[PDB]
């Protein structure tokens with residue numbers, strides 16, 4: 296029993312983290328096969344970040360200017376190219392610890408683990424969600440850029456995130472491993488504000504299932520609702536519209552608990568309208584939206 | 600910026616996890632040097648657990664009855680002994696991935712990372728605290744026993760916890776790596792209830808410092824208090840008495856923020872008396888008590 300905000304084991308990703316230095320900028324790179332991936336802003340001074348022309352800035356950089364260090368051993372850079380907002384540094388040595396991997400571009404509402412690194416060294420691991428506004432709520436200091444987000448399916452790491460920047464509101468923006476930003480964000484130090492942080496309705500419902508499975512049941516009520524009725528209440532509280540797709544995704548948790556998805560929607564409706572009344576659900580005083588239905592099934596069944 | 604419930608990177612511990620089978624019971628073992636550590640209840644049937652005599656049960660077990668598997672390779676057991684509530688299985692092969700390690704017995708209020716495993720395979724990593732009632736609030740299914748809790752100081756893993764049992768109230772009890780239970784708990788399936796889950800005052804104050812450092816400041820007020828005055832309010836709300844030792848431990852965070860510990864105590868007092876009023880602090884709707892002052896400094900400074 297018990298339900299915890301749970302990251303993937305970080306070992307496979309720890310083995311891929313390197314230090315990248317260009318001039319006075321040190322951040323992290325991801326070493327897979329003979330390629331090190333890092334944010335292209337490694338080449339920028341903080342002054343550059345105001346209005347950088349990356350193609351022009353990059354012309355002044357040679358292979359020997361990219362200092363790549365795996366623990367205490369230097370890697371030889373034999374090539375470099377810019378792909379969107381990442382640099383791919385070709386090194387002469389394949390990472391012997393390269394796990395099976397994919398690059399995946401995730402959807403908002405999807406969760407992933409971040410291995411926070413500084414100077415190519417792991418500091419910690421925490422679970423995130425791609426927010427509906429395409430930000431993440433991370434923990435990232437200067438030097439943490441190039442830290443990656445990932446999922447693991449058995450032995451295959453799916454990298455979905457590289458950390459690039461902090462918005463003045465303390466939320467985080469980054470790219471997939473092809474270097475495309477999630478959402479409208481740019482690697483420039485400019486006026487970028489996040490849109491509405493809407494709550495991931497399908498994840499809250501998943502987490503309400505996890506609560507019932509783990510003994511927290513006080514919020515179950517005698518009511519049901521319809522998608523359309525629920526969605527009126529969703530709109531009012533800046534929750535994502537619930538779709539039949541979301542209902543279908545919750546089917547296994549419905550089946551396991553014997554609570555119809557729409558009945559759980561009616562519970563969530565009363566919770567939105569009436570609050571917690573100073574009660575908690577799985578040790579939380581608000582509705583948690585960074586567990587996917589897949590996360591709930593994984594944790595509740597003990598997948599490794 | 601940003602502050603997250605953050606586990607240690609699990610790689611060093613992943614390298615130590617093995618499967619232990621005795622008869623029909625499979626759980627996890629910790630392989631350090633040529634010793635595998637696992638809960639002594641590996642030798643019990645669920646029927647045994649009602650009133651087990653471990654010395655007597657153990658007499659019927661030989662080295663060849665302890666099936667120890669690291670990934671897909673079997674380890675030869677050349678010795679076995681019981682130390683308190685753990686078994687030490689001597690194997691003929693030193694774990695080549697043994698990190699630098701210590702066994703430490705932690706105090707209540709101290710935090711640690713758990714690597715949840717099933718069948719010697721990592722499922723996930725989350726941060727815990729030894730509760731003042733000597734329980735932890737974990738995520739543990741059948742097969743997760745022998746999962747360990749740890750801290751890392753640079754390159755040295757300090758193992759503090761092995762998971763042994765779930766109380767009927769869904770909270771968790773276990774041992775240090777010498778096999779001594781935290782608190783009054785026994786590896787018997789019996790009437791064991793947890794005492795009062797008191798809140799770790801010093802950790803809440805640490806976390807209020809982390810909030811101020813990361814921009815969440817609405818709860819700062821014009822008031823101060825005394826240890827004795829604060830402790831009246833602590834008593835009422837089942838918070839640990841705040842000691843001068845706790846005040847001294849918060850000194851660095853006080854210095855960094857310029858908020859006197861007793862002024863932060865006065866903030867915490869108003870929060871206890873008046874609630875959050877539907878506001879959040881570092882994305883939480885309750886007062887978080889599973890960050891130590893050390894955790895806050897580590898995360899806020901980017902220690903690796």
Ligand SMILES: *CC(=O)Nc1cccc(N2CCCC2=O)c1
Pocket residue numbers: 320321322341436437438439440458459460
């Ligand atoms: C994105 C990131 O991590 N930025 C970064 C890397 C290295 C150094 C910095 N600094 C140091 C102080 C000024 C600054 O931006 C930032």
Ligand SMILES: *CC(=O)Nc1cccc(N2CCCC2=O)c1
Pocket residue numbers: 624625626645740741742743744762763764
């Ligand atoms: C402590 C722990 O993990 N217990 C454990 C290990 C292996 C198998 C079990 N089971 C399976 C179903 C009944 C039972 O107790 C428990």
